Each structure stands twice: as structure tokens, then as C-alpha cells.
């Protein structure tokens, strides 16, 4: 009964893992508490991206690799144009989960 954990691999999620690990190594918290923070994080990111996101970007390029396993799509787009709100990107890994249960 939880949310996807892919977001822990993002910049903000990875920073949280860092902060969380320093407190564990300092013995300021237990690893279990750290894991519980990470699981709350998963929820919060999913809700924050759903309710406080407005931008709509688009990616155009050559699909170098694709993959679909366990209800997860993975795409490696090379030599593409990412337009936000235009960005040239040599390579871009896209990992996505199902919007449905």
C-alpha cells in the first residue's frame, strides 16, 4: 500500500538520502526511521508534483533504447531537443511508472 520509489533517484530525493545517512552514521537516528522518512518522501513527491506542477515540456529525438518490465518504461533518448515552459541534450534517460494501479 505505497507510492513508487523512483523519485528517490532524483536530485531532491538523493539529497534526502545523503542527509539521512549522515544522521545515521552520527547515530542520531535509526536506519528504520530513515527508511520511514524515505517512504513519506515517496508520497509527498507524488502529491507535490501532482498539485504544484504547471510546466509541460516535450522531448524530440532518437530513441536509442527502450524497455518495459514490471510496469515500468525506460527510454534512452539521444541527440534530442527538450523544450521547457529549448535545450539540446546528447543523451537522456527516462524512467516512468504507471499512472494507474
Amino acid at each position: 500500500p505505497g507510492y513508487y520509489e523512483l523519485y528517490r533517484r532524483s536530485t531532491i530525493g538523493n539529497s534526502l538520502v545523503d542527509a539521512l545517512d549522515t544522521l545515521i552514521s552520527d547515530g542520531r537516528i535509526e536506519a528504520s526511521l530513515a527508511m520511514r522518512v524515505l517512504e513519506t518522501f515517496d508520497k509527498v513527491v507524488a502529491e507535490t508534483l501532482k498539485d504544484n506542477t504547471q510546466s509541460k515540456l516535450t522531448v524530440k529525438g532518437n530513441l536509442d533504447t527502450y524497455g518495459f518490465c514490471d510496469d515500468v518504461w525506460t527510454f534512452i533518448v539521444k541527440n534530442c531537443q527538450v523544450t521547457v515552459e529549448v535545450i539540446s541534450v546528447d543523451k537522456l534517460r527516462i524512467v516512468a511508472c504507471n499512472s494507474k494501479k
Binding site: 533504447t65 527502450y66 524497455g67 518495459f68 518490465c69 510496469d71
Partner: protein, 180 residues
């Protein structure tokens, strides 16, 4: 006739002779998709020759999209080679082409309903369902999809020769119902 149908698709089967963990294949092969909930096989594609393979847990697979007998065997060999490279005792066995599809263009229009009424026992035409006329040829046993445009689809062949013989046989009747 002066025209030679173009082979557009060849379906072949290959027994790799060894059980497979589809979940593992999907994990180590690139361009692979595995969704057992809808199909109990791993779908994998390669670029040369541009084809798509259906790999099963039983170690057997189907290779589709090939445009020549050679590309089909060649593509089949690459898929088997990947399965091996992943870690299975896969072998290239029982290669066999199961279906060849070809298309044509006689260049002229065709009065389909006249062709259907004439060859009622072989053709089924009901634009309501499908715009093309379905001609079920007896010898060779090839199914043709005849369109008003002059475009012809021939399928059901196991030898590329059957597509050719099927087209030669139908050309006279196609010509006979040419809109002119």
C-alpha cells in the same frame, strides 16, 4: 503481367532448445518488453535486419517483419545469439518460415463488385466491413486482398514462389475488371 510482387513480411519459428526465464531475458536484453499479464512472452526487436521476435519460456520463438528468407534466418540467429549472450543454453534449431506476405500495384483501378459477382465462390466483398475484396485462391492456396486502387496483397504462402504464382493467376481477372 510484367510485374513482380514485393515481399513485405516473413514470419518464421525457431526452437532454441532450452527453457527460458522470460523475466531474466527482459532484464538483460535491450529493447525488450515483458508484460505477462497480457502475453506470456518477451517481445524483442533488433535493427539489422529490422525485425521483431516473440520469445517464449519454452525456448521457442517467432521472428516477424523480415523481408527476405535470408534476413529471416539471419535475424533469427541474432536473437538466439542474444539469448545465449545473456546466459542460456540456447541453440539455433528447427528454423522454418510459416508465412510470407507480398504486395503489388497493377497501376489501374478495379471494379471490385463485378469481380466478386463473377467469382462468387472465391471472393467475399462487403465494403461495409472491409474496403478490399478477399479472394481465396485454391491453387496455390493464397489469400489476396484486392483494392479499388489496383493495390494487391497476397498472403498465406510458405514459399515466395506461391506469391508469384498467385499473382500471375489473378492478373487476367484483375485486368478483366479494370475500370476503363
Amino acid at each position: 503481367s510484367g510485374i513482380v510482387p514485393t515481399l513485405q513480411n516473413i514470419v518464421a519459428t525457431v526452437t532454441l532448445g532450452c527453457r527460458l526465464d522470460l523475466k531474466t531475458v527482459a532484464l538483460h536484453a535491450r529493447n525488450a518488453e515483458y508484460n505477462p499479464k497480457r502475453f506470456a512472452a518477451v517481445i524483442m526487436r533488433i535493427r539489422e535486419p529490422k525485425t521483431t521476435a516473440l520469445i517464449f519460456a519454452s525456448g521457442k520463438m517467432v521472428v516477424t517483419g523480415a523481408k527476405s528468407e535470408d534476413d529471416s534466418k539471419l535475424a533469427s540467429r541474432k536473437y538466439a545469439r542474444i539469448i545465449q549472450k545473456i546466459g542460456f543454453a540456447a541453440k539455433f534449431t528447427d528454423f522454418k518460415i510459416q508465412n510470407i506476405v507480398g504486395s503489388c500495384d497493377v497501376k489501374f483501378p478495379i471494379r471490385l463488385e463485378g469481380l466478386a459477382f463473377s467469382h462468387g465462390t472465391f471472393s467475399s466483398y462487403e465494403p461495409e466491413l472491409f474496403p478490399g475484396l478477399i479472394y481465396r485462391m485454391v491453387k496455390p492456396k493464397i489469400v489476396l486482398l484486392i483494392f479499388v486502387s489496383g493495390k494487391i496483397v497476397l498472403t498465406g504462402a510458405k514459399q515466395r514462389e506461391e506469391i508469384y504464382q498467385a499473382f500471375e493467376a489473378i492478373y487476367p481477372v484483375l485486368s478483366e475488371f479494370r475500370k476503363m
